[PDB]
């Protein structure tokens, strides 16, 4: 009895919804001086360490496919990549047909994945039509119609191609995310969840963990790992799924070469502006490849299988390589030091089981590339100089970005997949959840305010 | 707004191969997986398969994996679907269709395309 | 594979008249069902999916509900426009399709 409005401000109480994030860095590079296509641009200074806070006593709701973010980090990376490729040089002046041979090396009679080319070029603007000469890998390439002599860049048809700056380093930096005032960001520290529904133990904080933007397909490599056994993340709506995300909760080594010395050539195009065409292959002459420990990997695909079946409890499970499509898909593909690669992992993938370490050493090969398509956009794509001298890498698989094939009698079928590279960050970004803060509470009390 | 032109129809030949076509426009031509999908006069309709246009990913109905391939033109919002071998049962109407999908999951169709009839005999 | 059955094959209607078209699954399909018009010799028009949701530029005059392995499609107003080959489509796993449905005079 005897009861009256009262307000209360600063009421915690939330809802959720779209919000425009901050980008923040280590406030420059790592800590550090140097160039680098991330943290060089902008993206303010460093979290010192995240404030977190854990909340008593709330059950809360998370939806990583549904989720506000992922599409700001799209964005975000694209953004960085457009800004900083924008100033470097154009090689629309290469662009016309080129002679092109078998390519050489002494001791080498052919470099098989490989064409020797010469083409027309400007040396300085208005000054003699002049002859220079490269060798490309073959799939940055097309040939002209007929048993022809006469090939084209892959992209200079369709696309403008930028030279990424050789100034610039591919490195991924340790991003973080944080929300402006009045919205939060929740974690969901749950060491089982599965991407969908209530969380039990939560807690909040002004800024995400690191997340580092590596650009990747099949393979989530250098990513965090899961705190239980192996989780599976799909979505759940139907059977039918565009991703499956895999997401391990122990780090499969894989190391990764490009053996021989590169020979990079300058060829000038303008003022200040020049183009490092892929001058003569030194040394004693292999292909890209990379090597996994047997064992880890056998053992990493039956744990994966024995909770795969979990979702799926009729008797055989399968795996195969990709069935089609660009090389950015039907590969698994990353950006070693600063070239790219493409790797044929169809001896991963065969493998079979049904209901009821450095030894057999497995090792893979890989073609290599300088054109590049970025996001799967079309109209622009990326060159990328070739690095000299011979090259070393080390990474950490993390999970896997499978898909679903037809369902058959008794039989789920899986293969590498993903390759739209919103599945990477919602990989990570699983995590989170930004909400804003409603601070003006209104209740019942047992008080009346004086009228004097 | 939307569209889905085809060609590629008419009578072919017993045991050739055709290669059917699709032209898409007036949306984000990434954003959408592609089914192909049939019907034989007399019969429901069928999936043959899908694809997403952006990577050039393709799925096959399990009967027909053998025979069929998917690719596209992506500069020219355009699809194309081999079918070898052809049979006399192959004789049917052809459609691309567009697929709604979320993140996560595909769903149903919004738009079906003009229709492709096929007739196998020599 | 999952079935869809249609029934009737073929309906029995005048104008104006409530109208109500069926179809079942071999199995659960959750909701994840949806139906198509398909007017004579041309690109078929989605109706309602997720066995209830009406789509955009839809007539009002359709409506659609669900109980477990069953789906129903309703009309308000037969026309003859509506007059015409219907048929259901599920999309919970793999996509499957009912033999289609004639609504007659």
């Known amino acids: 009895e005897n009861l009256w409005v009262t307000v209360y401000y600063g009421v915690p109480v939330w809802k959720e919804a779209k919000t425009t994030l901050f980008c923040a860095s280590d406030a420059k590079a790592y800590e550090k001086e140097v160039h680098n296509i991330w943290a060089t641009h902008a993206c303010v200074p460093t979290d010192p360490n995240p404030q977190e806070m854990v909340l008593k006593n709330v059950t809360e709701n998370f939806n990583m496919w549904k989720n506000d973010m992922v599409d700001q980090m799209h964005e975000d990376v694209i953004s960085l990549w457009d800004q900083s490729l924008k100033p470097c040089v154009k090689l629309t002046p290469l662009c016309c047909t080129l002679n092109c041979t078998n390519a050489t090396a002494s001791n080498s009679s052919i470099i098989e994945g490989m064409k020797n080319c010469s083409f027309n070029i400007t040396t300085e603007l208005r000054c003699k039509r002049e002859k220079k000469n490269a060798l490309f890998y073959k799939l940055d390439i097309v040939q002209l119609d007929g048993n022809s002599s006469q090939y084209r860049l892959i992209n200079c048809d369709t696309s403008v191609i930028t030279q990424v700056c050789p100034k610039l380093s591919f490195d991924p930096i340790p991003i973080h995310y944080c929300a402006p005032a009045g919205y939060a960001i929740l974690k969901c520290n749950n060491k089982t969840f599965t991407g969908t529904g209530p969380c039990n133990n939560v807690s909040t904080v002004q800024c995400t963990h690191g997340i580092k933007p590596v650009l990747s397909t099949q393979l989530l490599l250098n990513g965090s790992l899961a705190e239980g056994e192996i989780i599976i993340r799909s979505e759940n709506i139907t059977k039918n799924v565009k991703t499956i995300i895999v997401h391990l909760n122990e780090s499969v080594k894989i190391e990764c070469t490009r053996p021989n010395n590169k020979t990079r050539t300058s060829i000038r195009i303008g003022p200040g502006q020049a183009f490092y065409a892929t001058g003569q292959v030194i040394g004693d002459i292999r292909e890209a490849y990379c090597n996994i420990n047997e064992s880890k990997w056998n053992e990493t695909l039956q744990r994966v299988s024995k909770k795969l079946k979990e979702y799926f409890p009729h008797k055989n499970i399968t795996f195969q390589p990709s069935s089609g499509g660009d090389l950015e898909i039907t590969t698994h593909s990353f950006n070693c030091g600063g070239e790219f690669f493409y790797c044929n992992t169809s001896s991963l993938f065969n493998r079979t089981y049904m209901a009821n370490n450095s030894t057999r050493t497995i090792t893979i090969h890989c073609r290599i590339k300088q054109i590049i398509n970025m996001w799967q956009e079309v109209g622009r794509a990326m060159y990328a100089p070739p690095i000299a001298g011979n090259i070393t890498c080390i990474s950490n698989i993390t999970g896997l970005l499978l898909t679903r094939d037809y369902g058959k009698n008794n039989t789920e079928t899986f293969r590498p997949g993903g390759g739209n590279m919103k599945d990477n960050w919602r990989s990570e970004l699983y995590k989170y959840k930004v909400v804003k803060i409603e601070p003006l509470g209104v209740a019942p009390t047992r008080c009346k305010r004086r009228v004097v | 707004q939307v569209r889905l032109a085809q060609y590629g129809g008419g009578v072919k030949r017993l045991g050739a191969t055709m290669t059917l076509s699709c032209v898409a426009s007036?949306?984000?031509?990434?954003?959408?997986?592609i089914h192909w999908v049939r019907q034989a006069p007399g019969q429901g309709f069928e999936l043959l398969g899908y694809?997403?246009?952006?990577?050039?990913?393709?799925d096959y109905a399990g009967a027909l994996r053998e025979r069929l391939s998917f690719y596209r033109d992506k500069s020219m919002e355009t699809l194309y679907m081999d079918l070898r071998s052809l049979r006399y049962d192959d004789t049917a109407m052809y459609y691309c269709?567009?697929?709604?999908?979320?993140?996560?999951?595909?769903?149903?169709?919004?738009?079906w395309g003009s229709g492709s009839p096929v007739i196998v005999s020599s | 594979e999952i079935v869809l059955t249609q029934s009737p094959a073929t309906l029995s209607a005048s104008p104006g008249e409530r109208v109500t078209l069926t179809c079942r699954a071999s199995?659960?399909?959750?909701?994840?069902v949806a139906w198509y018009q398909h007017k004579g010799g041309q690109s078929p028009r989605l109706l309602i999916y997720?066995?209830?949701t009406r789509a955009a530029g839809v007539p009002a005059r359709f409506s659609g509900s669900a109980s477990g392995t069953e789906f129903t499609l309703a009309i308000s107003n037969l026309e003859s426009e509506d007059f015409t080959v219907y048929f259901c489509?599920?999309?919970?796993?793999?996509?499957?399709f009912g033999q289609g449905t004639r609504v007659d005079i």
């Open positions: 269709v567009r697929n709604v999908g979320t993140a996560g999951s595909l769903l149903h169709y919004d738009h």
């Open positions: 007036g949306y984000t031509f990434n954003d959408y997986y």
């Open positions: 694809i997403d246009p952006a990577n050039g990913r393709p």
């Open positions: 199995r659960s399909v959750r909701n994840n």
């Open positions: 997720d066995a209830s």
């Open positions: 489509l599920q999309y919970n796993n793999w996509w499957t």
